[model samples]
Target chain A: CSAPCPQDWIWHGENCYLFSSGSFNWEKSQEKCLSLDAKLLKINSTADLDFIQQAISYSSFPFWMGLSRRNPSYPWLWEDGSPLMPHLFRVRGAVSQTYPSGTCAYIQRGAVYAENCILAAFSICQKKANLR
Target chain B: CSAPCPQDWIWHGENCYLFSSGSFNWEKSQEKCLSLDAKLLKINSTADLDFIQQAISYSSFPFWMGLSRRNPSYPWLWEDGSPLMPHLFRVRGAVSQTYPSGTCAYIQRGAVYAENCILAAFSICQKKANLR
Candidate 1:
């Protein structure tokens, strides 16, 4: 069944996405998306990232995606706790693999970046398209 | 981050799945899955369905999946209310456009069939794979 998305959301591929309009901490951004029954963006596929990254280049500000490592020694994981597959892509901004404990990943200028989670930024929320 | 699935669940592709142990109606099957933070199985991709439909062959009894229409006139939709794209695949056991309301889809002998939702059958639950 085909249906329109909620106001402020745009349909693309298999899901409806909403780009954050305001800056938020990595933690707070997820809470906001949870309230809307969505999740912080998780680039699990290179094909999907290609399109989303295009949208990112045209937009402003670095926005957090759902990727982070619990500690400096851990693998980057998404909100559902799936690791970012090496075959898919890599996160930039690497500096000798050195980063704070709460290292988070975000998009900026159409590329993925790993940085401090406390840094405030916008987010992209992904809600599975709902057709009633 | 890596975590174990609950008892009786197995990881494959991007999600963990559990094959129901007992019979249940379509609506009741979904309720069981939700208690475990999952939804009834949604075959959203030909790639995903290839493996799952194979598993269905080894299981006993037809199992409900997350596909159906509001009525005979509507497009088949998944749990997220996304229409099953015709380009992806088609349901077998078709006999013209005859089916009762509250219709649902299921996997049997490794093929898809649209039938009465009230029929008692097992179900498959799809939960995003978790690693923490």
Candidate 2:
């Protein structure tokens, strides 16, 4: 269903987004989004990724997404505990090998990077929109 | 001039704004804005402040403004080297007396606060519009 999103939130497809301006560790970011009845942004397709890229293209800082892994050796998973599709990991540039334990994913320049979860940064949240 | 603003910028009155998503210390933030042919946002009136407040109201984190002071003993000044009006410092809650040397201002919850200039956070930029 299509309906106008609340002020400050941008609506696309069936979701509404709140791109946070605050910096927080991954855990805190996730909690904050949950408090708003949303979840850390979860990208489901290239179109989804592209939309988010354009939304924050002008931002001076990168944003946190819901992707993470239990360990560096394990496959990454979305915030909802689903495995990421293989093609979704094709990030540009050098992937960091030094992300400490509890690493999480952040988006910058339209690419994903692994960062220490404790390193604070801005985040994005997503929730299903109320369709008309 | 009446030419449309560059992509990703919002036109308001005679100015164009770029609400950054990246985080940086005050100095770096200013430099970044300048590199884009803008300046760290400097509010000239309540209307300006209100517009910025609304623009980033949905953000979870505070945003840096062009306010700062060399020392707590001195009055705050804008990045353009103008003294801030007395009423602008009337922020909500307890004002910090312990901001380190080179303290700068950031806006959160619709109020201003002094923070260390070296602390990284999101920022906003402003530039004159190409008016006709």
Highest lDDT, which number? 2
- Model 2: per-residue Cα lDDT over B1-132, one tens digit each: 233344445667767777775677888899989899898988988888888877766555778988887666777778778978767546443345655547788888677877778888888888886655
TM-score of 1: 0.47
Instruction: Specify the CAPRI tier of model 2.
Output: incorrect
A18-119: candidate 2 lDDT, tens digit per residue? 777688999999999999899999999877887788677645476889988756577778988887776765643324454555668889877787778888
Q: Alpha carbon lDDT of residue B80, candidate 1? A: 88
> Model 1 RMSD to the real structure?
17.2
* Model 1 Cα lDDT, one tens digit per residue, B22-128: 67899899899888889999887887778776555434468899887767767778888888866776687652455554778898767788888888887888888
Candidate 2 stretches greater than 4 Å from native = A1-51, A54-132, B89-101
Which residues of candidate 1, in runs, are more than 4 Å off? Answer: A1-4, A94-101, B1-132
Error at B89, model 1, angstroms: 51
Candidates' C-alpha lDDT: 0.74, 0.75
> TM-score of candidate 2's chain B against its reference?
0.87
